[PDB]
């Protein structure tokens, strides 16, 4: 029970499950009695294995431990009754990838960079807490009604997220906070492009080959030079050369606080010629 030391135990009478939103069990949208609050509810259904129980309660325990503005907030856990449940806050705006694609061009550069600073602060916290995310991507980030981004982990889409993953993590399963930094660079590109697919139609093998050949994603349109410089350094082949999350947070904070620094734009390489008088 020590695993749950940072969690609040919720009584089942306070929870109502309404609609399945994911699927040892299912995830539901529901309501929590604490005037009810909307919540997401992950269940561990009858028949779960020992490994599944250890993973489920371990997930609940770390989510309770995390207490940060940019990490999804655990409302509580049901561990004393069956089915067991993990209950989190709910965001009507949903996941960041779909959000940006449905709001193309609607935000200022400063708003976009602010979302990256928040994601970076959440990741710095996770790394400092010695938690390696392994699946950092815009699809795993929730957006609240204040445009605050909350790092989450919804599990795999299981689709292996090759184009978000650092080379050493793909090649030999070395997942660390430095491979999370690589993923963060990809998230920066996702944000600045309003959710474009990294590497467009390239297949997974083509992406890995391009990376090994030295190619990197080109600059997004209208992107601050400093922001593209930062994402590029997240994609250094040599793990030890990448910035740490503390460096990323510091840089993003300083750019936002001296906002003229974001007015210098990186050149964009057009794919298409339009000749006009």
Ligand X SMILES: Cc1ccc(C(=O)Nc2cccc(C(F)(F)F)c2)cc1Nc1nc(N2CCC[C@H](O)C2)nc(-n2ccnc2)n1
Whether residue 247 lies in the annotated active site: no
42 is in an annotated binding site: yes
- Residue 77's region, left for phi above 0, alpha for psi from -120 to 50, else beta, is beta
94 is in an annotated binding site: no
If the CB atoms of residues 63 and 266 are measured against ligand X, the closer one turns out to be 63
Residues 199-238 that bind ligand X (CB under 6 A): none
The 3 state secondary structure assigned to 227-276 is HHHHHHHHCCCCHHHCCCHHHHHHHHHHHHHCHHHHCCECCCCCCCCCCC
**Nearest-CA neighbor of 231 among 277, 276, 191?**
191
Q: What string marks each residue from 36 to 75 as x (binds ligand X by CB under 6 A) or -?
A: ----xxx----------------x---x--x----xx---
Q: Which residue of 15, 27, 170, 249 would you call a contact of ligand X, by CB under 6 A?
A: 27
Give dist(CA 130, CA 26) in Å, integer: 28
- Measured in whole angstroms, the distance separating CA 161 from the mean position of its chain's CA atoms is 12
181 is in an annotated binding site: no
The token pair that represents 70 in the structure block:
């940019």
Q: List CB contacts of 58: < 8 A, sequence separation 6 or more.
A: 3
185 is in an annotated binding site: no
If the CB atoms of residues 68 and 239 are measured against ligand X, the closer one turns out to be 68
- What's the burial of 37, exposed, middle or buried (CB within 10 Å: 0-12/13-18/19+)? middle
If the CB atoms of residues 85 and 217 are measured against ligand X, the closer one turns out to be 85
Helix, strand, coil in percent for the chain, rounding step 5: 40, 15, 45
The catalytic position among 104, 135, 180, 253 is 135
Please work out the total of residues on this chain that contact ligand X, with binding judged by CB under 6 A: 23
Residues 77-136 that bind ligand X (CB under 6 A): 86, 88, 90-91, 94, 126, 133
Residue 53 and residue 47 in contact, taking contact as beta carbons nearer than 8 Å: no
22 is in an annotated binding site: yes
Binding piece for ligand X, criterion CB under 6 A, among 34-42, 192-200, 242-250, 262-270: 34-42
If the CB atoms of residues 190 and 207 are measured against ligand X, the closer one turns out to be 190
27 is in an annotated binding site: yes
Residue 166 and residue 179 in contact, taking contact as beta carbons nearer than 8 Å: yes
Please report how close the Cβ of residue 57 comes to ligand X at its closest, in angstroms. Answer: 12
Give dist(CA 77, CA 10) in Å, integer: 6
Residues 152-171 that bind ligand X (CB under 6 A): 152-154
Please report how close the Cβ of residue 187 comes to ligand X at its closest, in angstroms. Answer: 13
Residues belonging to the binding site for ATP are 21-27, 42
Could you list the residues that contact ligand X (CB under 6 A)? Answer: 21-22, 27, 40-42, 59, 63, 66, 71-72, 86, 88, 90-91, 94, 126, 133, 142, 151-154
Residues with a known catalytic role: 135
């Amino acid at each position: 029970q020590a695993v749950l030391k940072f969690t609040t135990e919720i009584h089942p009478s306070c929870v109502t499950r309404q609609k399945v939103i994911g699927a040892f069990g299912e995830v539901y949208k529901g309501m929590l009695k604490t005037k009810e609050v909307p919540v997401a509810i992950k269940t561990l259904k009858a028949g779960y294995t020992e490994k599944q129980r250890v993973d489920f309660l371990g997930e609940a325990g770390i989510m309770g431990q995390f207490s940060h503005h940019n990490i999804i907030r655990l409302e509580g856990v049901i561990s004393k009754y069956k089915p067991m449940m993990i209950i989190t806050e709910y965001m009507e705006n949903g996941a960041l990838d779909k959000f940006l694609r449905e709001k193309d061009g609607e935000f200022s550069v400063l708003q976009l960079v602010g979302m990256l600073r928040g994601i970076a602060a959440g990741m710095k916290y996770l790394a400092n807490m010695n938690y390696v995310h392994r699946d950092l991507a815009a699809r795993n980030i929730l957006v609240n009604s204040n445009l605050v981004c909350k790092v989450s982990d919804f599990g795999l889409s299981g689709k292996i997220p090759i184009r978000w993953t650092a080379p050493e993590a793909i090649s030999y399963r070395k997942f660390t906070s430095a491979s999370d930094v690589w993923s963060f660079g990809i998230v920066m590109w996702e944000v600045m492009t309003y959710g474009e697919r990294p590497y467009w139609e390239l297949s997974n093998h083509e992406v890995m080959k391009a990376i090994n050949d030295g190619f990197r994603l080109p600059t997004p349109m209208d992107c601050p030079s400093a922001i593209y410089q930062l994402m590029m350094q997240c994609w250094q082949q040599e793990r030890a050369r990448r910035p740490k999350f503390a460096d990323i947070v510091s840089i993003l904070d300083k750019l936002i606080r001296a906002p003229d620094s974001l007015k210098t734009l990186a050149d964009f390489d057009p794919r298409v010629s339009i000749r006009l008088p």
